[PDB]
Design a protein around this ligand. Structure first.
Ligand SMILES: Nc1ncnc2c1ncn2[C@@H]1O[C@H](CSCC[C@H](N)C(=O)O)[C@@H](O)[C@H]1O
Ligand SMILES: Nc1ncnc2c1ncn2[C@@H]1O[C@H](CSCC[C@H](N)C(=O)O)[C@@H](O)[C@H]1O
Lengths: 258, 258
């Protein structure tokens, strides 16, 4: 049989909860915001490890997938960049002269985006109505980009997030949310059996970031199909208005119900 | 106070001991052996996480630090590439027409180097005398490159490794071993206190690789100064013949004693 590895860490010498994504983005920006400077490390709750280059968070508009390019060029009115990261999307809108605000729960991400020139509210999405300063919003356009629909989480979390966005939305507001329409890879079969034992929806993973001795919170993450997204929206304040594909990716337009 | 994060994994859904480095190198080679394809993730025994791009293991000679370039161009006779990885150094020697053998304990690394065209013995360094096939060696030149001296480990491990290399060495053989002469960064103070409590030498870390659900063995790793290396060699079959610096890096030439 296969031998489990056993965890790192001991009392006084172990990873601590904090803001590893902010640290990665800060290191990336400090080197010029290009590739081969800093790396995001994601750990799943079974310990599955995968990394990627953090330069993606600083990529200019011409390098974005078409679904993100479409969303940014259509943005109008008061824009909220939901989960802005290093601000690549909202920064493009600010350069174009629009009224843009980012929101992100990572203090370090917020600091990086602000340094690049984007106003950022530090808040969890579900804290938006409580944290939004008077005079900001209501918003005409919400950006949920960078597999943004995957950040919606489980149906319960998605409904609370969408409810929070509607609370700060202007009449007729839209969410421009992109996603991936891909089947679950076959090697995920064992992880999916674990999901079923725990009552968790098919296709979700529970993941966290790690960097140096810092660890982020567990959060739920998925690739949500356009049909899955339609089901999530039933009963919410939001109508699925259209779905636009670019190969594997899609851009969904959600409209606020009157 | 700061809150410890708590480990990932549960019975039946947790990381397993295996060959994560081989998996990373295989993914890198399968994409063309360039950057932005696959990433090495290193975890220290306190849980400290750092990643880097695995493309470095496929870099051509013109991209190597000068200390590695010097070593490879001086290699003569029967060469052993000690800890060959994806084989970048031995491959250059094989292309130049030399008799070269790699040795690596990662089966996947060995497979990658072999596919690129380098003969590789799968063995731990300390297993070289037992595993070396008759007719291979004795070796005139040993390459210990890519902060190779850092792989020597603690003094006890270093002495056993050097003893194993001498066992398969030709008369007058040399080890060409590179290293880093840098002070310990100040943020390592807490980790160094942990070393002292455990009787472990100043400047060492205990680290392992992680990739997907695989975890490598714990191994000891250090940046060994030229003076540290001289102390390690006292009593061994090896004399420190010369030290050549290129900025922060050095190339040490060790000569087999008669
Ligand atoms: N529940 C939540 N509330 C607020 N921010 C969140 C969040 N979940 C994730 N985030 C933030 O959303 C970002 C996701 S990374 C994507 C960033 C950006 N949309 C881009 O495409 O470049 C991270 O910066 C993370 O801190
Ligand atoms: N004790 C040991 N015995 C055999 N191989 C070892 C070893 N410790 C580390 N290695 C191998 O040595 C390699 C270190 S990475 C460096 C590879 C190569 N020298 C280069 O510079 O590109 C890894 O492939 C690892 O599997």
């Amino acid at each position: 049989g296969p031998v489990p590895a056993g965890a790192a860490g001991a009392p006084g010498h172990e990873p601590l909860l904090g803001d590893p994504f902010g640290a990665v983005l800060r290191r990336c920006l400090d080197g010029g915001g290009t590739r081969d400077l800093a790396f995001e490390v994601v750990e799943r709750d079974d310990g599955f490890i995968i990394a990627q280059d953090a330069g993606i968070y600083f990529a200019p508009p011409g390098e974005w997938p078409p679904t993100e390019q479409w969303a940014v060029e259509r943005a109008r009115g008061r824009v909220l960049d939901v989960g802005c990261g290093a601000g690549r999307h909202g920064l493009a809108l600010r350069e174009a002269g629009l009224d843009v605000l980012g929101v992100d729960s990572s203090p370090g991400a917020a600091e990086v985006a602000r340094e690049r020139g984007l106003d950022v509210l530090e808040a969890r999405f579900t804290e938006l109505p409580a944290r939004l300063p008077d005079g900001a919003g209501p918003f005409d356009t919400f950006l949920l980009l960078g597999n943004g629909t995957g950040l919606l989480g489980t149906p319960a979390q998605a409904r609370e997030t969408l409810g929070a966005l509607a609370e700060v939305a202007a009449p007729g507001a839209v969410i421009l949310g992109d996603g991936l329409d891909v089947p679950v890879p076959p090697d995920r079969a064992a992880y999916e059996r674990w999901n079923a034992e725990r009552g968790r929806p098919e296709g979700f993973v529970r993941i966290r970031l790690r960097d140096r001795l810092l660890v982020g919170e567990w959060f739920d993450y998925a690739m949500i199909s356009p049909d899955d997204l339609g089901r999530v929206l039933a009963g919410t304040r939001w109508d699925l208005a259209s779905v636009e594909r670019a190969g594997v990716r899609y851009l969904a337009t959600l409209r606020l119900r009157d």
